[PDB]
Design a protein around this ligand. Sequence first.
Ligand SMILES: *[C@@H](C)[C@H]1/C(=C/c2[nH]c(/C=C3N=C(/C=C4\NC(=O)C(CC)=C4C)C(C)=C\3CCC(=O)O)c(CCC(=O)O)c2C)NC(=O)[C@@H]1C
Lengths: 172, 172, 172, 172, 172, 172, 162, 162, 162, 162, 162, 162
Amino acid sequence: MLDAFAKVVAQADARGEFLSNTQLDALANMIAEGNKRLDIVNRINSNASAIVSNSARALFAEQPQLIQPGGNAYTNRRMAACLRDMEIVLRYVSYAEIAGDSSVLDDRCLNGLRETYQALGTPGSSVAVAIEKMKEASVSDANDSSGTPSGDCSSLSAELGTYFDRAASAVS
Amino acid sequence: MLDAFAKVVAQADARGEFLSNTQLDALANMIAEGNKRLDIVNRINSNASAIVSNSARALFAEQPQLIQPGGNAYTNRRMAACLRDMEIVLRYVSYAEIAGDSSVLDDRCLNGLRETYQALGTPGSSVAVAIEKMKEASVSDANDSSGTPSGDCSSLSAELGTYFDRAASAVS
Amino acid sequence: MLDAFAKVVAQADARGEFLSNTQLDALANMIAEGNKRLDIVNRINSNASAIVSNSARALFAEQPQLIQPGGNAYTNRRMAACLRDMEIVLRYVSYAEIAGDSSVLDDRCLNGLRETYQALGTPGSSVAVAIEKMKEASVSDANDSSGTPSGDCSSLSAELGTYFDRAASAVS
Amino acid sequence: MLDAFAKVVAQADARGEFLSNTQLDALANMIAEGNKRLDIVNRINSNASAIVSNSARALFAEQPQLIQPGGNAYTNRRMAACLRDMEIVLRYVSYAEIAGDSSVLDDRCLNGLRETYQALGTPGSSVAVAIEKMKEASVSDANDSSGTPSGDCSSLSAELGTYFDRAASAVS
Amino acid sequence: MLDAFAKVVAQADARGEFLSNTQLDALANMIAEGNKRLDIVNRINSNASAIVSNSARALFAEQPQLIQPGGNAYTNRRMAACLRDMEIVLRYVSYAEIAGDSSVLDDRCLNGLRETYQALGTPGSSVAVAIEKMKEASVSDANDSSGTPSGDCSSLSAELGTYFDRAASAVS
Amino acid sequence: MLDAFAKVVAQADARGEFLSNTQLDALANMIAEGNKRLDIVNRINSNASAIVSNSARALFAEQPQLIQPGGNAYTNRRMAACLRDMEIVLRYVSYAEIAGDSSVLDDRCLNGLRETYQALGTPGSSVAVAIEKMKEASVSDANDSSGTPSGDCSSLSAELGTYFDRAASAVS
Amino acid sequence: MKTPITEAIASADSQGRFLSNGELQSINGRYQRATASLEAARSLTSNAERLISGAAQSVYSKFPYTTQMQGPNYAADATGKAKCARDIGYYLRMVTYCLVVGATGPMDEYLIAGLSEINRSFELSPSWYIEALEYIKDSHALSGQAANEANTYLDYAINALS
Amino acid sequence: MKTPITEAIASADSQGRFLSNGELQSINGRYQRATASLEAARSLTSNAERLISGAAQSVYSKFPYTTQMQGPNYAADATGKAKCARDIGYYLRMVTYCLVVGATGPMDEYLIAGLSEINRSFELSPSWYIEALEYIKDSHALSGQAANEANTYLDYAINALS
Amino acid sequence: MKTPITEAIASADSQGRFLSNGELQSINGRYQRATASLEAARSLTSNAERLISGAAQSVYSKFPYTTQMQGPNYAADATGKAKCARDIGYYLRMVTYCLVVGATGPMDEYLIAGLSEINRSFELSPSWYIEALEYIKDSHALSGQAANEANTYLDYAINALS
Amino acid sequence: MKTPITEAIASADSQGRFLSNGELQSINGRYQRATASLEAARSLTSNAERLISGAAQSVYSKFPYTTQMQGPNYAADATGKAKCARDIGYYLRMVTYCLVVGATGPMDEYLIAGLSEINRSFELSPSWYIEALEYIKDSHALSGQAANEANTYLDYAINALS
Amino acid sequence: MKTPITEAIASADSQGRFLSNGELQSINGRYQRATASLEAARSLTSNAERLISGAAQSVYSKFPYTTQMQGPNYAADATGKAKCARDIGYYLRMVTYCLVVGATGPMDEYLIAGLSEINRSFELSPSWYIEALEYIKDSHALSGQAANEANTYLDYAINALS
Amino acid sequence: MKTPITEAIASADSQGRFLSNGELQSINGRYQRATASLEAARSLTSNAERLISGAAQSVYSKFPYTTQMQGPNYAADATGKAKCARDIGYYLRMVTYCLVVGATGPMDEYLIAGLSEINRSFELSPSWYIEALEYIKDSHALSGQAANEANTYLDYAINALS
Ligand SMILES: *[C@@H](C)[C@H]1/C(=C/c2[nH]c(/C=C3N=C(/C=C4\NC(=O)C(CC)=C4C)C(C)=C\3CCC(=O)O)c(CCC(=O)O)c2C)NC(=O)[C@@H]1C
């Protein structure tokens, strides 16, 4: 997998080039935004159980057919797997956020997921709703200044939103 | 795998329903037919090597080209594989018979077998004939009342015949 | 795997026949040629590193683009895999040569290789150039009489070149 | 492993003998006690969690030093191991009870336990106390006639007490 | 393991020395003894089943107590293990013979054997008798000119005898 | 395993206590020397092959018997195992150094080493000499202010020496 | 699904062999016990509604805080009380499935697998269910071996929760 | 040794758990069938020497050569014939052991393990034994389920031989 | 115990190599964050009694029934409430150890391993502890990064419980 | 198929290397022995009919019952005797193949793999074949190393049968 | 590619969990060291041609035999010396990549994996590259932690070569 | 140590069987080749001193630096040159061992295993040894197959160095 730094390096190596002063400057900027990126990831890790369970609770309340007998989330084994998938997506998004690159998300997690759900009979549009709820809960936590020095994190929050969106598209 | 009891339960859980009166009746009937079903399985078990070998003997007398040099059952390794397959089908049919359900036979034995024989160059029509000879031998033992209180086993013998038939259709 | 002797045997067995006096005569001739065949393999073995390295050096001198950054043989890991691939082909060819049958080269080495290279993005034509250079170097070693009783080995050297060609055609 | 029947058979085989009519009578008598032996084992299984948990609770109420910082049952991992060891002994005792022979208990569970605990720093007399409490709970369950035809199970309840006692002494 | 040549090289290496002309002459005599050494091993290989079975038959005829119930060789499992141990010993003796050194016999087979039998309850002295019977059958075959150019194999057959004696002494 | 911080926490836990302010300040003294401890570890990593090789060279100049034929470091496999051991000790000393605790070194490396070398016949006093040469080289590197802000590291260099000494005493 | 019959079959298959007498004898042990099991299953099913409703009340009376502490995971709301009765019915239905197949298989697969994860995540207390299961044991009205069968599976569930 | 009880215990232990109701039902199964099994074991035991004698004679009648081929593996000699009756007695004794414990365990352990190796090494024809076994089946004169139990284990041995 | 330092060492060792500069920077990362962590550890520790007492009261006010339902499992008694405050203090103490070593290691090993089994066996509700931890987070009165540190580990515990 | 050459290759390949001098030597050994082998192979092939017929007759004489006993399993009938002669010819033809490739591979592959299962399932006695192989050894009339080669492989078959 | 960040992630993923505080801490250590890392990277890059030139010449002066003895594998020729400066330039560029990502990942992946095979096959002496790298350490003129960063990765390459 | 004979044994043993004709045949290949092998070994040994001395000189001329260049590893002293003649003598002595056992085993075990580690750590150039081996090949003056045997092992060492 690649983080944002490794990605610039891999692109540079294939051309046999040293990074440019301009590229080095863009990486310094990312280093400067590091504490803030770490706050965002810490907010996700610190609220992981809530982000997942509250979003699932909301999904099953909006889509009760998922949990009735014969629904894809009926029986505790299936309910457990559904909560697990939501947690997996949230973990991979959080990995993408600390890496500042969607690679780990795309390769270890989203690649083929759409096919997997179609084969299982898991409704992908419902999984996307689950992911959109986790995104909303997360972006809301990321935008909350309680616990951090006040400042602008709009770039980072927007970036976090793009990762959740990549996940929501891939499952459908 | 599922036995006849688990299959009814699986159909009821998918509907989120307690078993119906007709379901509970059918299950009571399976229990009542139990000793008889056991007698049939014991006949196969007690006559397994004869059922296999006498059937293979008849198969090769009818189709000598299987054992001619170059034939699919020529060399002891291939003859042993052939006899093994017959014993395997007989084993799984006996499992489906004690189970009262073909799931074990279908999934652990029949699934993909037609493709396997085509890929090997094993003539499927011949495998089917070997299977039909075992069924004939087994149904005949099943109709022999020596060793059992005399009574009616016609539904059980027909069900046994059905499992052998599923196996014979699956190989070509 | 089959050597030349085992091949005639497998063909005779499928026909249920004993080898004819003529086949027996043809195999005795192969036995007569054994020492010369062993000399060829020993020449390849004793010069393997130089055959492989001098051929790669020649290939990279002609196709510098392969080792430039971005090229398929750029980075030591890829250059090492390229050298290993050349050594693998040289090995299977030597095996074919002492087996006196291409079956081993075909089965364990050339089969599916054209595809493997296409997927990796490794230029089949370059691999073929590499093989052709190794063929050239080995055939030259084979026609060198220093260290062997002077004699005619034309048949075997032509057989050796055939194995290399099989490899050169299989990679692209 | 041996149950009471296999034990007699193994002794008879080493002497090259068939069981005597007296031995057959003794096994028949054991067969007659089967439903009662099954009821006792069902009672343990059905109350396993309470038997273990209440017994540990009593032990820690008596020996509070076990759970305070530094004690052997302090931290959840050690408490979990302690509870687990109690269920293991109860499990093995239940095994000996259905087998009607202390063999599996003495072999797979008691032999060496004394050293293990001495090595670990686990107070043996404390473990013997836990076992003694599970014994009281279990024998009391076994003597309870609610849920069973009323009858005499004193020899079975005596046998049950004997297996537990073997465990209590095997640990210190 | 070591064969006779490697053992001489190993000792020379530890002294950092080239083999002397006398050592080289000793090894050349070994090469001269080669065909005869190959005939001895072939005789054992060609008569292995008879050497083992006939030897076992004689041991059981003089020591019937081994096979009566309770005897160490009673039950087919134990008889099979006893035959297996004779074959293993014969097999290792034949390796020592082809190697011209007892190292593979001592390391892979005899070291620890006496302990094993003691712990097992297997009477080592009976195992030695079984071995002495195989040695006598084997030496007898090796001194039989039927099928070999008539000549002197006294040195080799005396060496074969030494390997059997080593095995016989190692089991008690 | 434990680093210095974890060691204080484990002692505290077993006593059921929070760390005192004194303990917290003592750990803050460890944090304050952290950059220096890192420099020492970096010096060792950055000079590892020289520390090992130059030390081994001096050991073999002082003790040529180790490399003469028959010696414990004679043949390249043994010479290489010897260099690997020096490197393994050096790695474990550097781990103890970053941990600020000898646990990892005593547990995963030194425990049982004395017995291992005695069983192998490796002269332990020669290994201790090797380890003392690596200590001398490492401490000389550590006292070298080239590449670091100038300051006093005598306390850390003494601690580093203690780890090396623990290893040297353990091998004999 | 694991039942006495599929288990005998899995054992023979894992050894590439036909079932033998011991196995047929084990299965007949199941058929023999089955008359008491089916009697229990017919009764729990005919009495499902009274048992479930009866069990839910028992829980609300024993943990009156769940009928009051209002939030998403409590009997505070109509939805919560309906979910509670729905869950209890799940447990009763699973016990009838186990009776029918002669094993815990149905409960293990449809309910117990993932149970710890679910109760933890939605903050459902095992104690609530234990109380409902105790009520069922106390209220079914079966006797003899049919009661033994029912209680054995209800106790298996209690054990899974503690 | 494999019996229905040791087997249930071995499975529960392998899964670190108490015996399941499935296993208690299997053992119930063994207790239920044991009256017929012990009845068969008592009668075969009582008639052993008669059964062994008739069986050996049946073998010699069917395979005339074995009694007239003076060699180690032949009924030709006194030793050969003594061993033949001895072997037949072993199959019969193993059969009673199987009846006693309720499984094929005893015969698997004491006779079938290594059986192919022995018959191959000593050139004993499995066919000779199958004949002795069929004679026993035809001669024990049991009836009902006691006959079913005996015949089942006797057929188990014939199948191991073919 | 897993700390950033022992962890870096176990990884280097599992690869038979010297620590990497990446691992040195990682340890430097822990050395840099330690000032904030040690300050949180000192503060929570000096306020330990009032945090623990206040957390227990907060659980008693939110789960009235625990101090009401009289049995071994509830703090309906002096022993019961004593164990509750003792458990609450264990959580706090673990949190300070995590701060001290810069990782969840101490809490993972001394408290979280086996937590599920103990809460299930003794019927302790994870929700009770979640409320105690929420209380501590709202009450420690830390600020800046010392507060972030404290809260990150208190939230980690909350997550282990839900 | 396993020959001295495919074996050397398989070894070299398994270790990812070129054959080494030791294997060239091994292969040289096969070329050296081949003259004796091919002479044996030619002679056995030339006298195959004679040999197969005399072998079969030797078996009928030693085991009279097989040419006497009714059943497909016996060379009593024409078909049984034709199968027998056919089988004996299979052993002879495999022996010639071993001589040709210089190893037991053809016999291992085409006949020994699965031999125990066939002989047991069809109740063929290993002893009948051993007798035919002994007859062939005594009647091929080869001398010197050609006889050594032929007998070695015939003895190898005898060993697989016992 | 292994960096402090991807390693933190790979580790957490291998355990199916979110990164913990220990890991965030390690990543902040990377970010805190990055300032010196990037300064070293910018400087080595702007001076690359001077360093590569100076390193190539230090090699020819020390092993003049390379520029002496000829063939394809030497500093004797144009392509040889061209390839030498090119290789040196590769070492330097990998060094700046290691500096930019905070770990030896780029150098491990792009240069060290397969290095001994290449040096052996093309008979390139590792001693040549060690002289070049020592020259660069002696000539980059960085100071403070920027120098330490640069030298650590330069020393990592020398160790891979020795 | 791997020899054609120990290798045959290992394979037989790896299959729990006696050696078969194929393998005896293989060992016969080693016995037939041995006369040329021992002729080569005897000659290389009687000429060891002048071959070794000549080989060292040959290396000193091709690589003049090592005769000048100061340093322990370079023969810029009496010791360095004594170690050089010493190593060359080891390669020659290992060559004679291979010739004696008929395989590369001695060389593989005493010299090649660990060779890359040693040459890298002590900065010894594999090219220096190739030069010495080429010189021995060009100077032993053997002829016929004995020369073939000698060069095959000398080229095997050359291949191990490149
Ligand atoms: C002492 C142990 C208690 C006691 C028991 C006792 N039980 C019975 C009889 C039966 N118990 C069962 C129970 C089982 N058999 C099985 O199949 C299984 C599960 C698969 C179990 C748990 C049964 C079937 C019976 C027979 C019932 C019937 O109605 O026929 C008795 C009665 C006498 C007997 O020996 O059969 C007794 C005495 N009784 C006590 O008072 C103790 C408290």
